[PDB]
Amino acid sequence: GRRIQGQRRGRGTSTFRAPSHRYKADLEHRKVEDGDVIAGTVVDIEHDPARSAPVAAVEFEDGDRRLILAPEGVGVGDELQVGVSAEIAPGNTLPLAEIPEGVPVCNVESSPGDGGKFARASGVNAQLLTHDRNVAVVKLPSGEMKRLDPQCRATIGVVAGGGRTDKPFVKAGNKHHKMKARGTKWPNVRGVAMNAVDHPFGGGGRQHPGKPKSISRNAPPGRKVGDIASKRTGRGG
Template identity: 60%
Template sequence: MGEPIRQQRRGKGSSTWRANSRNGKGDVEIKNAETAGTVVDIQHDPARTAPVAIVEYEDGEERAILAPETVQEGDEVHIGPSAPIEPGNTLPIGEIPEGVPIHSIETQPGDGGKLVRASGTYAFVVTHEKGGTRIRLPSKSFKKLNTQCRATIGKVAAGGRKDKPFVKAGNKHHAMKARGKKYPHVSAVAMNAVDHPFGGSAKPGMPKTVSRHASPGSKVGSVSARKTGNKTE
């Protein structure tokens, strides 16, 4: 009898599959108010791929936001519908012109920003439509959002992070360990048939869709898939 498959070992939740985020800066969200602040520091956050900017707002509160490109210490950032279209400022997407790069986008008004938060990424407004604003995500898919959902102007800093070569296996090991992933990662079709449902051969023509009620040892591939392809909404 084979060992538990990768999905079963991951689901156990042991330290092997758990990302080390104890040194993170905590929640990095857009302040839910119309205000302005000054960037007092740019810091590295071990729990994320992008640096964070520490902003001191008018009410004295200090809060971390994702650092956009070109923003530096001493710059002012504004939150509100009347804020200038400049990197670091946050506005409702209904007030942002088409083609302007944005990040840290809310999916519901006031949720603090959920989309496009990785280093070097950005989305942009495609068109303002009746009942919403359509944006294009880094995945090249489109999403329609409430015009009151807010977004921050500019690209997330630290673009090109993946261009630097790892050079040696130790650097790759530590990079994968920080993300809570097992390294090295063995392809399922390269395993023996006893170790994985995809093992033994490439199995051309074998469907990858399995039932939601399948046994844990065979629940791999597309579980209870309703359709395939990318969503456009």
């Protein structure tokens, strides 16, 4: 047959790539020698093309001007701090250790210094539950209890732009514009609507998948389609 769409993606051609040349900044926690003294002033709020959420421009004491993953409630003029001794207020970054338990956190690092990996999407937030001298237990937006090095930096508060998902797109044209700002091929043609040569579900006098949709974890690319290694399906039970 022919390579299915999922396989064209991998080649990374223009159609599947993200409009990077159009993206603003790589919202990473600043690197501080130590001491925490580092503080800056929010100079402006901006739109982040890559996350459909607002992002804050900050001017740091030592001259550095960098965009920041802004939590909800940050406004121009406000003063933010990054360091072990940073005050415990929204918009401030410090290691999970210095953070009091029971406080909403965002843009959590996976390993100390990476710059933040978790909870960065619109209106989401991690929850710092347990502390320790060895492990910091954080509840991620997915509900999972993640164990992280207490040295992993994070920002206090939830991410800005919450509720974005509440409003329906209403029309194809609205999806269209968003999609044009992401690394995604859209619209999507159903597998079952294609020819047998283009997809494992193609063919047939009438549209219907050929075999069952739950495919094995070991299936090769080109065949792994439908419900991948489903532990179950449906809504029943």
